[PDB]
Amino acid sequence: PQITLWQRPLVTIKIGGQLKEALLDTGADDTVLEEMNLPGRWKPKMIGGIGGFIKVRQYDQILIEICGHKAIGTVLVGPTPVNIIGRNLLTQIGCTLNF
């Protein structure tokens, strides 16, 4: 699809069999999702935001569907204002910016 930016580019994602709303975010290196249960082990990660740095849990090789496109990659879990799909997964779904 082609998504304009007059409103927030919110899409439906599927993860752990559950639908969530998430923001397609070209300014984010990494995908960060609100607190949830994910399988396997996690490792520590620091991410830097507008307000400063936060600790998040890093889960690798997670199955996630974004606007119907399947991806498998790193998902960070922590206190984010909204679920965000960052470049690590935007690249997997073949997303580009165009003007």
Ligand X SMILES: COC(=O)N[C@H](C(=O)NCCCC[C@@H](CO)N(CC(C)C)S(=O)(=O)c1ccc(N)cc1)C(c1ccccc1)c1ccccc1
Buried-state track 64-93, b at ≥16 Cβ within 10 A, e below 16: bebbeeebebbbbbeebeebbbbebbbebb
Q: How far is the CB of 74 from a second copy (least distance, A)?
A: 15
- The answer to whether 66 and 31 are in contact (CB under 8 A) is no
Quick check: is 25 catalytic? yes
Separation CA 67–CA 59 (nearest Å): 21
Q: Catalog residues that contact a second copy under the rule CB under 8 A.
A: 1-6, 8-9, 23-29, 32, 47-54, 67, 69, 80-81, 84, 87, 90-91, 93-99
8: its two tokens = 């927030």
* Closest to a second copy by CB, 59 or 83: 83
Q: Which stretch binds ligand X (CB under 6 A): 13-21, 42-50, 57-65, 90-98?
A: 42-50
Residues with catalytic annotation? 25
Residues at the interface with ligand X (CB under 6 A):
23, 25, 27-30, 32, 47-50, 81-82, 84, 86
